[PDB]
Amino acid sequence: MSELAASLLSRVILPRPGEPLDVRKLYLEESTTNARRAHAPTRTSLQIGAESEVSFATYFNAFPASYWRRWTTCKSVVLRVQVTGAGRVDVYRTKATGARIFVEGHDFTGTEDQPAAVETEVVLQPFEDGGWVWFDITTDTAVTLHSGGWYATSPAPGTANIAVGIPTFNRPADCVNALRELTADPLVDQVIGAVIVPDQGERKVRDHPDFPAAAARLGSRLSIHDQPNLGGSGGYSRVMYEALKNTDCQQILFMDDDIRLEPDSILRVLAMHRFAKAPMLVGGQMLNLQEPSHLHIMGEVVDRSIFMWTAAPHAEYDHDFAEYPLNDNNSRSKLLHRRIDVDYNGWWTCMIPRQVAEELGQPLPLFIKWDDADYGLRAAEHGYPTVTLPGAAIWHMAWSDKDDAIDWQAYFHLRNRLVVAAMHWDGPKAQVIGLVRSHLKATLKHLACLEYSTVAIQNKAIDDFLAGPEHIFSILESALPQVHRIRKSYPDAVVLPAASELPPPLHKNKAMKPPVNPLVIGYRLARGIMHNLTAANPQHHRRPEFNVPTQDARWFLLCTVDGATVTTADGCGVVYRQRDRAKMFALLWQSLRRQRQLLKRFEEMRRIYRDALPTLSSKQKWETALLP
Amino acid sequence: MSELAASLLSRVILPRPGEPLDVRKLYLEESTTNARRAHAPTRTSLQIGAESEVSFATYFNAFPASYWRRWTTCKSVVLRVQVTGAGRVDVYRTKATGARIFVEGHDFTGTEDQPAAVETEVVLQPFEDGGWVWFDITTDTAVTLHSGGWYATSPAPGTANIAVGIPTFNRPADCVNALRELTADPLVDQVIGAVIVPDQGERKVRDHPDFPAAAARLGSRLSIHDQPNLGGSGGYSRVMYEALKNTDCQQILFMDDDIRLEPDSILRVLAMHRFAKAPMLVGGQMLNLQEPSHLHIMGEVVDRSIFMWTAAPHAEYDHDFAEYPLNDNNSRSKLLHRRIDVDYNGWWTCMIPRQVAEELGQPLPLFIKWDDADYGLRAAEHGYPTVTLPGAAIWHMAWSDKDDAIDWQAYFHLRNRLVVAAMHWDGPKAQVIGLVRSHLKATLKHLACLEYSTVAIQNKAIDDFLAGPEHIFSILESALPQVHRIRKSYPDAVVLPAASELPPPLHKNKAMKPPVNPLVIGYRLARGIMHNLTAANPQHHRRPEFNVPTQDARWFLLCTVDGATVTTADGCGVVYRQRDRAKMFALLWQSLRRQRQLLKRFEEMRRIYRDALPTLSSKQKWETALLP
Amino acid sequence: MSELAASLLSRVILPRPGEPLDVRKLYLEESTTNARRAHAPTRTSLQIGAESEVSFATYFNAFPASYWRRWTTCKSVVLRVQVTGAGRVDVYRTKATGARIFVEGHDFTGTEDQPAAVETEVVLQPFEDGGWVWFDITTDTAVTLHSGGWYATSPAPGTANIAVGIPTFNRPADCVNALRELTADPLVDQVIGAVIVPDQGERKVRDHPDFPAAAARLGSRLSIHDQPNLGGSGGYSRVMYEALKNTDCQQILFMDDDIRLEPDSILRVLAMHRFAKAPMLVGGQMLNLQEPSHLHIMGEVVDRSIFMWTAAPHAEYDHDFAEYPLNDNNSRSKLLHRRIDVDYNGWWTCMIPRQVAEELGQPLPLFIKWDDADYGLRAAEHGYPTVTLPGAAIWHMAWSDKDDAIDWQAYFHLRNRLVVAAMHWDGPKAQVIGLVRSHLKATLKHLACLEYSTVAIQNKAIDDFLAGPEHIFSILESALPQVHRIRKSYPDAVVLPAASELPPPLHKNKAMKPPVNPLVIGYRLARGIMHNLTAANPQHHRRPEFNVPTQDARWFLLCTVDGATVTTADGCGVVYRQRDRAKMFALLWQSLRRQRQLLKRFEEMRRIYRDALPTLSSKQKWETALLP
Ligand SMILES: O=c1ccn([C@@H]2O[C@H](COP(=O)(O)OP(=O)(O)O)[C@@H](O)[C@H]2O)c(=O)[nH]1
Ligand SMILES: O=c1ccn([C@@H]2O[C@H](COP(=O)(O)OP(=O)(O)O)[C@@H](O)[C@H]2O)c(=O)[nH]1
């Protein structure tokens, strides 16, 4: 018992009372033939009826064996369940193809007075490519699973002193909640030493009514640091800065302020970090906050040849565990059993070892976007891999219709993408053509969609990149206001609350089906080009031709009109997109001029950016933008 | 009652407590409309709720009528169930198309005090092509099925004295368990007279802690015989040798050491043997140990025209009875109602009559593979057919991803295949071209997959075959070490624990979809041939181009690379396959030279092998390799 | 209450205790959401749980409205249910497309002490093309349906005195049972006045042990008449003969001896007959005895243009009410809502009014087959239509794999088909070419399948037809033995118990998939013709090339072989079909010669057959073959 608690890797957890049935599929998967639902008295125990089966082949309770095999020193894991009643524990593993293999099974008989203990040691040898381990319970009489867990065969190396960092910006209510959920589970609280909150917002988290109660439970492990708005980069950079200077914490764990939490997720990541073969970044997955049974992604990489972040080779976005169980014979579920290798983890949950952060230094001053990838790629170049752990997750806001890469962020995508590209493009010379051809495609689509402001702000992006690193650092704060100033000009960047704020449409909308037939995309594009050569009628800038819903607003519909309203992706307003031939060819020329500049000057940008990294990632340099 | 027990063919059995629901579909098939699961107090009884239906149209409890009709003297079978409660027994049969026919039905009323007995005599006449008989129970009040069985209308001929043979090699734990499960059911124990265990391993089954307890229950019906490693052939040959010389047992039942058991399976095979029209080999099916609701195969044959073991005409591998019930209108289930005729049964469970083994003599000294087929084909030539009984099964390890025919065994497949081919090729002359063309295909695929060691050891196989029978017998022990010595050379035959033991791959893996389009297999093969003509870059033998998962590693992916790691089929390690043009054309020439030798010298091999059979299958000759 | 019982059309009936769940779908259709199965205390009552729904949109309990509208004088029907508990009766109708229409609904509250009565009058007006009426029950508290029925709004015209006729031939056990099930329901017993059993068999129904008990319940309403074997024609002719001469029964109801019964079926047919607009034949459907949820057919017609009995225009054989409910949105179920018009009903249950049988006279002396159609077609020509009532059924043996039109019956099909054709071909002259072209197709298929005996006995059929009516009558008894004498010659007509009675096949059977591709049926037929021109190898008449299963034995497989065993359609034996070119061309010539004879002499056969009808259907003439 002394040694048990210090080798626990991940617990068997159940859902809270009154949790939606969709979300319960993350925890336990019950047979539709059982007479009654299973009951979860506490988050660690479960009551099962007589003559019933429940399967723990689930996102939260199954053991992601291949990952432990690959990155940790654990030769084998031990399942321990403590149960009363008569029944059977069946242990299964999978091959990386998803094929389920029955390992061993134990019949038990237990009473509340002499509770039955069931231990099974599963060797991690057969998980080179992938595979999970899990268990089912099948009952003779009624059964209570009092506790269950996956264990290593020796204590966890090192000490567990975690600096939790949570940068906040005008989301006090959410942040106060994140601080509240850290102290929920005693086993997390115990291993938290410091909690850094860089408050970059004008509506402060200290001012909240529920804060004192939340802050009291943390004691003086909590500090709040007021600084200017420096985005993600500045937020997390501050956390690193603090944890390395003002705490002696062995781990730095980046988190977001708008996250729901499964506290065992934190403990699982810590487990892997401590058991790692070599020092490494360890991150958690994100479940979708707005569709909570859905896993966002198993892991991301940066695709060379266009230098663009993307899904890892054998992983698809948005995996609904309620519709596609871990153990189903469907093709989406079969990919989950592969071991996914990432280039970086997102900063919703990402643990960085102390003397690794010290070595890599700070993040790049990118404001938002790409800061996290850069860090992953940088650590990789120093021999510190990143592992995105399955089964260890927080719930975060996804791009569940809500977001887009056409607004002000479109600047920060492109700009930072190039910055990071110069930083890590250790490859062939002629390769940069692939990224610029990549952008030309994007830029033609934008214009075809009448998203003019986007192109403009993207042309500022390429200008700002070409001015170098010294310049990027000085516009950490100034850049955001500058994007907005540019965007005010364009009717397509000015949100209006309703389309009824404008004169009713000339034409009622018609259902125009998505062309995915080769003959039809050829013709719909020809119509697009030719119309786009005619002089735009200005009557259509005063009265929109259509009231376009977000969903229906693609290249093929917008290339025929001169003016139309398009609903913002959140569905909170509309922009009045208005075609103009003169303004478009201008933007198109400026875009062409910048793309030619890029392939001409990229060799040069690699040299000057790589050289400037000790500065850009220095604590000393970040001091002059972080402290008043 | 005196006469009942001695005419019992197969009992109605239920699952153990806490058996997975998947596996219970082997026993009883319940209506999703029943209010509650059915309960199995004992392995022979079942409790059903009021207003409920359960169907015994299942692998274990249905009667494989066509088989009994074909091979046994039974004109009709009698169902006997003993039941309490009010309900109805409905008896069904099938045609060989799967079409279900209702035969008769009996309403019963029984109490525990005056239990109701229900007998139905089903005539076996209408089962020429195939068909099963089974029964359902449908309840008015709650019902208990106290016992149920299929009976012949007269006593079983002969006496039941079974020599059970279990050859073991370094699997003490498993073997001790097999000996334990034989004495489980009293009705099996009663008919076991001897249990021979040839222990060819250096980790002895006697040394096990649980052995004394297991051996005590057998008394002195158990002997253990220490001998050198002589593979399957030597193991089972020893069992035959012992049972014919040192026991007066009427039957010899071959078993494996790594098998879970349904004891009634043993009794069913014995039943058929005793009721046989003429003396015959009777075998049991294998269920998959690692996917326990799945039946491996209904029966195997040796396909003339390539002389290669294969699925019997109307049977497909891997039949999941949980997904495809015996009585479903699906195409996979419809094949189960045909009567499958085999050429041989596997030696997991195969019963050989005493004066049949005496007549046929020993097995061929093949070490592993084909020993069993040869025996089936040999018995066939003497007028002793083999029947693979459905419903009579043990659970055994299948090729559930775990195994492959590319490693050291690839020698023993080819070699023994040819040995056996010479032995039983009573057919046309020019026919041998079909086997050699068969091998040329295989050999080109191997090389294309960079599996060089395979070809090498297969070329030893053809050399060893051509040296004749006298020579094959002397290399019974020496051959295995010799294969390994040859395999050490090739990087593709040397297993390494992880791919991270090697330098990281040059390219990340890309999803390349299986080409089954005629235009695409033509082009993907053209790329294969042409690249395979270019000089291999040696930088790719020092740093692998890919980290290939087993599943993704086929001809079309491996024919483009010069070097890559491929994960072993168990998923326990990786080999570094490395292309070389010079070494390949060498192997290809040596393979071509041997194939030309075969068709030249096969007439000659038939003559010299057939002539040498009295020697190869002699007890006297096997003495000089079995006894120190 | 006085007037209720004499206007009852059909009762709401439930299944017996322990009836299979498949068959219960004929009676009531329960929601999978109900907490418990519904219970049927008695065959007329049903107990439903609280908060549950059951739908009586079922074969047995729904009202076939369109039929009642079309053929009876009933302007409207009345549903009456007597219920306790709180709940709601919902009444629905359908359009002939299957579209369900909600009519009205009644909330009830009843107690056992003051039981609630619910009456709904549904007008039959909107059922021109088809449509059903039914009701569902939906419960608040637990509900008991004590009784339910469909009623006319006035008493039944006429008196109900039914002569039940059951011809038996060597099936004593079955016949004794039919007599037992007539006296089961008191409401059937009451309306049965006589039961005629012509016993044409040598194993007499009187000799049975269970007969005296069965005969006692009938009193002296039962007579048994010994006569020679004169087949169906002679059996039923005898029943007519008796009921018209020796009873004063108002109805004659033909039945079979191998039928399970729903007694309300008898009452429903009687109901319609009594309520008929004009005098008419009224028949019941047949449910499949061996697949009891399956309806054989909604109704049959005689297809002019080939003069061949067939499914009525919008009806398909074999409708499984368990898989396709009356009220499902599937295409098979949608045809059930059309009103099917028949040309005749089968003699399993067919009611003939007294002064209609008197007018039409006896059946034709056809021995078996077509006797029933002829009678339907004859009655039609006199203005007496036939109606096949849905919901009124007996269970009878179908052609559920068991039967075929290639054996001795093949004579009686063709012969009688032509007899009947001459009798009723009131159409165009050149039309007979269509029947003879029809036969040429059949005859070429037979020969291609090596079914030589068939063609031979069919050529006797055409000879016997051409000899005229006077001759057909004299061979009523002699013809059956004569067919057998001819069949003894041919190896394909001699059944052997197993294929193992013959030398094992030269080739093992190969799976040859059904060609339904235009290119492939063209080639598979070309192979057929050309091989069929080569001289047959006689070694293949001594050792069969294959062991062909019934299912796999079609034109495309048999046209390539010279000799093979084919399993009888019951699966009880095999015939050795053996190709011969000399014997085949002979049969083919004799067939061609007869077909030329037919179209030459059909005008002549119409004249001589039609003229001979008063004789063939005379009671006086049938006397000389029915009485010793
Ligand atoms: O003007 C800004 C925009 C965002 N952020 C920070 O950048 C991170 C990511 O931004 P956001 O949450 O709005 O985008 P999301 O994560 O939802 O995609 C957050 O931690 C914010 O604190 C910031 O400091 N200032
Ligand atoms: O080096 C060996 C390899 C195997 N065997 C025997 O050969 C049989 C089949 O081998 P194995 O079980 O390893 O293969 P599998 O049956 O799983 O395919 C077993 O009964 C072993 O006892 C042996 O005696 N020596």
Ligand SMILES: O=c1ccn([C@@H]2O[C@H](COP(=O)(O)OP(=O)(O)O)[C@@H](O)[C@H]2O)c(=O)[nH]1
């Ligand atoms: O040799 C025969 C053959 C049959 N029948 C009668 O013909 C009818 C139909 O024959 P069967 O029942 O054998 O054929 P099925 O109705 O099953 O198709 C039955 O009522 C039999 O009594 C007969 O009298 N003598």
Ligand SMILES: [Mn+2]
């Ligand atoms: Mn966020």
Ligand SMILES: [Mn+2]
């Ligand atoms: Mn084995």
Ligand SMILES: [Mn+2]
């Ligand atoms: Mn019949």
